[PDB]
Each structure stands twice: as structure tokens, then as C-alpha cells.
XYZ file of C-alpha atoms in Angstrom:
65
model
C 19.468 1.269 -10.142
C 16.641 -1.168 -9.456
C 13.754 0.357 -7.585
C 11.279 -1.615 -5.521
C 7.848 -0.832 -4.158
C 8.063 0.742 -0.711
C 5.109 1.535 1.583
C 4.344 5.294 1.517
C 2.155 4.965 4.624
C 1.326 2.169 7.101
C -0.786 -0.335 5.125
C -3.020 -2.246 7.542
C -3.653 -5.979 7.254
C -6.152 -7.193 4.656
C -6.402 -3.779 2.988
C -6.584 -3.321 -0.786
C -3.608 -1.375 -2.117
C -4.119 2.080 -3.610
C -1.688 4.260 -5.580
C -1.185 6.642 -2.645
C 0.205 3.712 -0.628
C 3.115 2.837 -2.899
C 6.284 4.806 -3.616
C 9.394 3.593 -5.378
C 12.920 3.614 -4.063
C 16.268 1.962 -4.591
C 16.577 -0.253 -1.526
C 18.181 -3.497 -0.441
C 17.171 -6.151 -0.309
C 15.200 -5.844 -3.548
C 11.447 -6.359 -3.376
C 8.618 -6.302 -5.907
C 9.769 -4.218 -8.865
C 8.451 -0.680 -9.123
C 7.095 -1.381 -12.622
C 4.556 -3.762 -11.035
C 2.883 -0.987 -9.041
C 0.033 -0.575 -11.501
C -0.943 -4.238 -11.155
C -0.744 -4.376 -7.339
C -3.586 -1.819 -7.201
C -6.573 -3.458 -5.506
C -4.596 -6.520 -4.297
C -4.644 -7.025 -0.523
C -1.729 -7.426 1.843
C -1.690 -10.354 4.265
C 0.017 -8.514 7.111
C 0.339 -4.936 8.312
C 3.145 -3.204 6.392
C 4.838 -0.406 8.341
C 5.789 2.899 6.692
C 8.979 2.593 4.610
C 8.852 -1.232 4.385
C 9.826 -2.844 1.097
C 6.863 -4.821 -0.251
C 7.892 -8.436 -0.932
C 6.009 -10.981 -3.071
C 4.969 -13.003 -0.025
C 3.139 -10.038 1.545
C 0.538 -9.675 -1.200
C -2.373 -12.074 -1.549
C -2.484 -13.628 -5.008
C 0.738 -12.077 -6.335
C 2.788 -14.064 -8.832
C 5.242 -12.296 -11.123
């Protein structure tokens, strides 16, 4: 089924995303699609994102699908 991006470590506020930060899992509710990982790289989050949190569109500065 449909995988989303999930935080693979705590991602602090205002921190640019790296590939080691993002895993993919089938979770609900559904978040940013796992195929968008590659383009989230270097975008910043606007809040701290705890380990295992699904990344949602409103958490990433500048994201529009």
C-alpha cells in the first residue's frame, strides 16, 4: 500500500532535511508520499518532528505538491 515519509530520527525545528532523516512506511493517516523524498532534501521543517512521526505537507517550509 501507500507509503508516506516518516521521521527516522528526531528532526529539530528549522533544520534542513537530509536523506538519513526520512524513512518510508505504510501508516495512517497518509502523509507526504514516499516518492517525494528526493525533493524534500534540503527543505526545512517548521516545527520539531519527533522520531516516527509522519511528515505532513504543513510541516515543511515551501512544500507544495
